[PDB]
Amino acid sequence: GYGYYRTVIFSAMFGGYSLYYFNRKTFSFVMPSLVEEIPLDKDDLGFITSSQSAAYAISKFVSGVLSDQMSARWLFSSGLLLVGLVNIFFAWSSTVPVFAALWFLNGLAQGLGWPPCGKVLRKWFEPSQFGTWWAILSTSMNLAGGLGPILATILAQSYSWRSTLALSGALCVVVSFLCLLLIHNEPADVGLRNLESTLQELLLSPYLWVLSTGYLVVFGVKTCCTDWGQFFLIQEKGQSALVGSSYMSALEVGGLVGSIAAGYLSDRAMAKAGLSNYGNPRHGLLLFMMAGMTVSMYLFRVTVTSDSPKLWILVLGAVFGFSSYGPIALFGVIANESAPPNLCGTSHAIVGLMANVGGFLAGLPFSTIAKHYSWSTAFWVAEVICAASTAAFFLLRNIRTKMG
Amino acid sequence: GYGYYRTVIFSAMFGGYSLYYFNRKTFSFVMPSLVEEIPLDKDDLGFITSSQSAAYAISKFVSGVLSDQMSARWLFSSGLLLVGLVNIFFAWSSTVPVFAALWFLNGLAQGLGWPPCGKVLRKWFEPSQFGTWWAILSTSMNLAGGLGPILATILAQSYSWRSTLALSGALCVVVSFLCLLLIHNEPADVGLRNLESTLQELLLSPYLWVLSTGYLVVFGVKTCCTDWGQFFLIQEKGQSALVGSSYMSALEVGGLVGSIAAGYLSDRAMAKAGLSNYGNPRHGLLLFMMAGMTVSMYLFRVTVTSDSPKLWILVLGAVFGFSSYGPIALFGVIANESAPPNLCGTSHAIVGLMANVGGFLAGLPFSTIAKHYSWSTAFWVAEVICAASTAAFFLLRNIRTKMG
Ligand SMILES: CCCCCCCCCCC(CCCCCCCCCC)(CO[C@H]1O[C@@H](CO)[C@H](O[C@@H]2O[C@@H](CO)[C@H](O)[C@@H](O)[C@@H]2O)[C@@H](O)[C@@H]1O)CO[C@H]1O[C@@H](CO)[C@H](O[C@@H]2O[C@@H](CO)[C@H](O)[C@@H](O)[C@@H]2O)[C@@H](O)[C@H]1O
Ligand SMILES: CCCCCCCCCCC(CCCCCCCCCC)(CO[C@H]1O[C@@H](CO)[C@H](O[C@@H]2O[C@@H](CO)[C@H](O)[C@@H](O)[C@@H]2O)[C@@H](O)[C@@H]1O)CO[C@H]1O[C@@H](CO)[C@H](O[C@@H]2O[C@@H](CO)[C@H](O)[C@@H](O)[C@@H]2O)[C@@H](O)[C@H]1O
Ligand SMILES: CCCCCCCCCCC(CCCCCCCCCC)(CO[C@H]1O[C@@H](CO)[C@H](O[C@@H]2O[C@@H](CO)[C@H](O)[C@@H](O)[C@@H]2O)[C@@H](O)[C@@H]1O)CO[C@H]1O[C@@H](CO)[C@H](O[C@@H]2O[C@@H](CO)[C@H](O)[C@@H](O)[C@@H]2O)[C@@H](O)[C@H]1O
Numbered sequence: 001g002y003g004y005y006r007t008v009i010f011s012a013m014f015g016g017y018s019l020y021y022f023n024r025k026t027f028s029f030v031m032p033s034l035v036e037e038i039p040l041d042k043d044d045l046g047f048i049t050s051s052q053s054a055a056y057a058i059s060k061f062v063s064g065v066l067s068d069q070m071s072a073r074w075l076f077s078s079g080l081l082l083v084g085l086v087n088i089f090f091a092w093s094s095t096v097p098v099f100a101a102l103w104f105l106n107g108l109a110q111g112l113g114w115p116p117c118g119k120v121l122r123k124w125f126e127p128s129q130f131g132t133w134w135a136i137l138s139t140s141m142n143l144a145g146g147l148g149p150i151l152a153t154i155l156a157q158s159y160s161w162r163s164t165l166a167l168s169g170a171l172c173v174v175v176s177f178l179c180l181l182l183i184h185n186e187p188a189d190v191g192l193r194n195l196e197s198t199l200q201e202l203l204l205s206p207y208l209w210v211l212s213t214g215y216l217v218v219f220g221v222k223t224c225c226t227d228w229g230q231f232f233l234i235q236e237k238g239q240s241a242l243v244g245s246s247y248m249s250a251l252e253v254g255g256l257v258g259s260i261a262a263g264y265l266s267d268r269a270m271a272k273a274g275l276s277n278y279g280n281p282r283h284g285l286l287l288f289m290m291a292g293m294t295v296s297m298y299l300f301r302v303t304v305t306s307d308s309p310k311l312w313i314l315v316l317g318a319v320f321g322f323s324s325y326g327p328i329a330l331f332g333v334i335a336n337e338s339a340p341p342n343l344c345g346t347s348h349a350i351v352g353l354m355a356n357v358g359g360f361l362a363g364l365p366f367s368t369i370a371k372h373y374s375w376s377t378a379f380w381v382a383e384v385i386c387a388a389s390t391a392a393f394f395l396l397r398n399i400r401t402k403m404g
Numbered sequence: 405g406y407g408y409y410r411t412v413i414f415s416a417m418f419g420g421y422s423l424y425y426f427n428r429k430t431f432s433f434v435m436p437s438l439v440e441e442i443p444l445d446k447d448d449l450g451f452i453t454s455s456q457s458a459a460y461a462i463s464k465f466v467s468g469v470l471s472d473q474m475s476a477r478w479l480f481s482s483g484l485l486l487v488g489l490v491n492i493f494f495a496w497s498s499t500v501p502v503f504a505a506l507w508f509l510n511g512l513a514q515g516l517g518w519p520p521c522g523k524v525l526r527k528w529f530e531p532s533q534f535g536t537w538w539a540i541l542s543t544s545m546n547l548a549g550g551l552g553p554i555l556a557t558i559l560a561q562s563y564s565w566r567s568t569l570a571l572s573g574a575l576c577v578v579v580s581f582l583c584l585l586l587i588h589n590e591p592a593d594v595g596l597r598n599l600e601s602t603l604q605e606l607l608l609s610p611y612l613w614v615l616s617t618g619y620l621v622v623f624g625v626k627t628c629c630t631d632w633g634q635f636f637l638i639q640e641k642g643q644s645a646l647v648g649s650s651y652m653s654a655l656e657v658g659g660l661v662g663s664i665a666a667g668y669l670s671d672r673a674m675a676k677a678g679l680s681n682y683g684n685p686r687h688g689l690l691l692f693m694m695a696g697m698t699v700s701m702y703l704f705r706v707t708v709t710s711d712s713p714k715l716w717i718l719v720l721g722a723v724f725g726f727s728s729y730g731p732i733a734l735f736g737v738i739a740n741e742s743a744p745p746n747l748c749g750t751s752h753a754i755v756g757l758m759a760n761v762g763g764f765l766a767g768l769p770f771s772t773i774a775k776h777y778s779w780s781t782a783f784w785v786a787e788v789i790c791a792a793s794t795a796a797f798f799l800l801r802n803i804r805t806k807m808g
């Protein structure tokens with residue numbers, strides 16, 4: 001049955017992705033115990049995390065490019081097995097260089113997880129049910145990250161820090177075999193079906209670069225606000241050290257809610273509306289959320305004094321999180337849906353690369369501008385850039401959409 | 405006349421490239437005066453240099469890829485004009501963010517200089533005279549860098565720091581028009597001649613990846629030695645603070661001599677020997693210099709005690725510089741010569757990217773290994789890697805050379 005097969009594939013995917021993220025964050029989970037056992041300074045942890053991040057970025061781009069030439073099931077299982085083996089080996093090392101070398105292969109293996117999931121979802125689900133399940137897998141990753149630390153410390157205070165990593169690796173290996181056994185690549189491999197534009201022609205379309213610039217701006221603004229909102233609130237507004245934590249929590253909760261709601265409403269709008277070679281039914285929600293993000297930025301910058309109630313700050317944070325985390329999922333869904341049946345990964349790898357460079361831009365120059373002039377000037381610059389981007393995106397709404 | 409036209413093109417190229425490098429390094433040349441005028445801390449200078457370096461790397465790759473679709477003369481002149489304009493605008497600014505934003509466009513413009521020169525050299529010169537002139541252009545860059553500082557401080561102590569940059573920009577604009585007028589793209593544009601493998605077929609050849617890995621190892625080892633030789637000599641050998649400076653000077657001089665000699669001897673060997681689809685006449689010198697580099701590394705690591713004469717240290721530094729700076733030029737020449745008549749830039753951009761990642765590897769993990777274990781262990785690791793690479797390169801000598 002279609003429902004039975006979809007349920008089985010979805011359950012296996014959910015479990016695999018949750019284990020992926022747990023084993024990504026296990027070192028940060030268990031850091032205090034190994035710090036107590038073998039002392040480390042602040043440089044070693046940063047070096048290890050930096051190596052993992054660089055490996056993750058490079059692998060992610062490469063596996064996104066290559067995911068259209070190899071089977072999704074084998075890619076998923078191999079990545080999970082390598083992640084488990086790397087964790088098991090990490091459990092039996094006691095020197096920084098070996099730690100940092102083992103945490104690089106971890107990023108390389110982690111880069112292989114999502115593109116197979118995206119391809120299987122696209123080939124198994126109808127285009128009117130392809131933003132809901134995307135967001136639900138994102139929430140699977142969120143749930144794994146949220147439930148990680150509590151169980152991690154609960155288990156670590158009981159036995160040790162070395163046993164937890166080995167147990168996680170063994171569980172990853174077992175679940176890798178289970179997912180290999182359970183996941184099906186295509187409906188044709190069972191007896192159903194739910195249904196050429198070379199790379200040179202794909203790269204010669206303007207929609208790809210429009211989406212890349214949109215992702216640039218959205219990710220950069222989100223990173224700027226997430227990284228420096230507490231700093232702005234503490235050093236210029238005059239608030240305490242708990243209002244920042246509450247504002248971050250509200251931002252995260254509102255962002256999760258906004259991602260799910262954006263996916264569902266966009267899928268409903270696409271199902272309701274028709275299809276044509278020009279335009280996209282998913283653009284209205286994207287433009288609305290962009291405008292909401294800009295308005296919330298302006299309100300937070302201007303109408304938050306030293307005597308503002310805490311409820312107002314929480315409301316502003318929630319609204320910005322909603323309107324900033326919706327469009328990210330929308331771009332991720334669109335860059336893969338509005339592509340030929342092949343080259344889906346190659347239509348998303350470039351977008352991820354733009355996200356990385358936008359993160360670097362949100363990191364260094366924003367901080368130096370804030371240090372020199374002020375935080376108000378830096379946030380004003382970010383808001384002006386976002387408003388200009390939104391205006392350009394609205395001006396370029398009805399364009400050649402289907403690339404190829 | 406062939407000689408007259410070659411002389412004119414060579415002179416214009418030499419002048420253009422020398423001005424390119426002078427305007428690359430002018431800020432480092434004139435830094436003390438502007439530091440005295442407007443105080444700066446150590447973070448701002450690093451930020452500016454980092455922005456320029458990142459822009460240079462990205463532009464270099466992009467312009468190497470794109471240099472086969474646009475005219476070399478126009479690319480050269482446009483790059484020089486933009487460099488001059490950027491310097492002129494930099495002369496009229498007084499704040500760090502604007503400085504760092506203007507020093508990014510400088511890197512973007514600088515990335516456009518060399519690939520047009522390489523294409524013109526390949527299309528104008530015979531393959532038996534294409535390693536000598538390559539090395540001579542490299543020495544043009546070296547001469548510009550060497551004669552920069554003296555003239556820079558001599559002029560800066562006279563008038564100001566603001567006038568020097570404007571004068572350099574104006575000179576760059578004038579020389580840009582002169583080079584636009586003088587450089588000829590092809591011999592067919594005058595009435596002579598001195599004489600399809602798509603990118604997908606080009607990327608499916610093993611010679612490209614062999615060359616990429618060789619450049620990886622050579623550049624990484626050279627960067628390791630250049631960066632940490634003084635540290636090793638001072639903190640483990642027990643030598644003074646002037647022996648390191650002498651060792652660096654000997655390394656640089658020996659490297660320049662080795663680059664010129666390697667180019668000349670390799671061109672002579674290729675002219676003497678025949679041509680075939682398998683192998684390359686330029687491999688013997690490359691293997692010999694690789695072996696010399698490994699032997700010199702071992703001798704410097706082992707046979708240099710706290711009582712070694714300074715002449716021995718100078719000799720070892722000169723030999724390593726020779727044997728390390730030869731192969732870099734050899735790889736640069738080969739990756740462009742042993743390529744189809746098109747895609748020459750695309751056959752060198754990947755090699756440059758590998759050089760960048762090898763530089764990062766030589767930078768961070770080598771330093772952390774040296775900090776944890778010792779400098780001797782780090783240099784032993786580098787020497788072992790170089791020896792293994794040399795053995796693999798010798799084992800893979802006679803292979804499919806002409807890619808396509
Ligand atoms: C084989 C590949 C051949 C070509 C490679 C290209 C260039 C080679 C290296 C370039 C590159 C990978 C290449 C990107 C994709 C390549 C795809 C293009 C294919 C071309 C066909 C690594 O290179 C940089 O990586 C930095 C690590 O951040 C290092 O900083 C070190 O750590 C610093 C502490 O922050 C200190 O300053 C110091 O400790 C070091 O300085 C740099 O020294 C290093 O140069 C840049 O990638 C970028 O990815 C992203 C996400 O990871 C990173 O963003 C952030 O990283 C972490 C915070 O750092 C966060 O955790 C992460 O959340 C965040 O997102 C970037 O930072 C950067 O990593
Ligand atoms: C089919 C449906 C699927 C089910 C999904 C539902 C479950 C999702 C909730 C999980 C959730 C919400 C918590 C509110 C719950 C109420 C919400 C109402 C609805 C749910 C009922 C818990 O998130 C927090 O949970 C806390 C408790 O563990 C942790 O505190 C710890 O406690 C200490 C030890 O006690 C520790 O020592 C200490 O380290 C912590 O202080 C926090 O670290 C964690 O952020 C969010 O988690 C997820 O959000 C994302 C945001 O992007 C976050 O990713 C971030 O991305 C970057 C930013 O873009 C950041 O740069 C990056 O850093 C980060 O990776 C993560 O946070 C992720 O995990
Ligand atoms: C639109 C492009 C879309 C994709 C971009 C890819 C990823 C985006 C950013 C990745 C990338 C450019 C991309 C490489 C080529 C891309 C071609 C691939 C095309 C794919 C189809 C910049 O990204 C890094 O650049 C570093 C600058 O070094 C920054 O470090 C900052 O500064 C630090 C102080 O050293 C501090 O830690 C701190 O102040 C910051 O942390 C990092 O924060 C930053 O992440 C990494 O490139 C690399 O190039 C080389 C040579 O320049 C650099 O090596 C060195 O740099 C200087 C010493 O640094 C030296 O002067 C230079 O002599 C030396 O060689 C590398 O360092 C790196 O720059």
Ligand SMILES: CCCCCCCCCCC(CCCCCCCCCC)(CO[C@H]1O[C@@H](CO)[C@H](O[C@@H]2O[C@@H](CO)[C@H](O)[C@@H](O)[C@@H]2O)[C@@H](O)[C@@H]1O)CO[C@H]1O[C@@H](CO)[C@H](O[C@@H]2O[C@@H](CO)[C@H](O)[C@@H](O)[C@@H]2O)[C@@H](O)[C@H]1O
Pocket residue numbers: 540543544546547548549550551553554630656657660
């Ligand atoms: C058709 C033929 C063409 C003619 C070519 C011949 C001319 C070439 C000679 C120029 C030469 C040799 C000097 C010995 C001369 C005898 C040699 C015998 C033959 C010649 C007769 C002078 O080189 C030095 O000259 C000194 C005097 O200016 C400078 O000291 C300054 O003084 C203070 C102010 O007084 C200043 O305040 C202070 O900053 C300095 O201390 C040094 O900065 C400079 O290095 C070498 O220059 C060139 O070498 C390359 C090496 O790769 C170097 O590039 C490096 O690459 C990276 C490393 O891979 C490095 O990381 C990177 O940092 C660097 O970019 C540069 O050095 C480059 O410029």
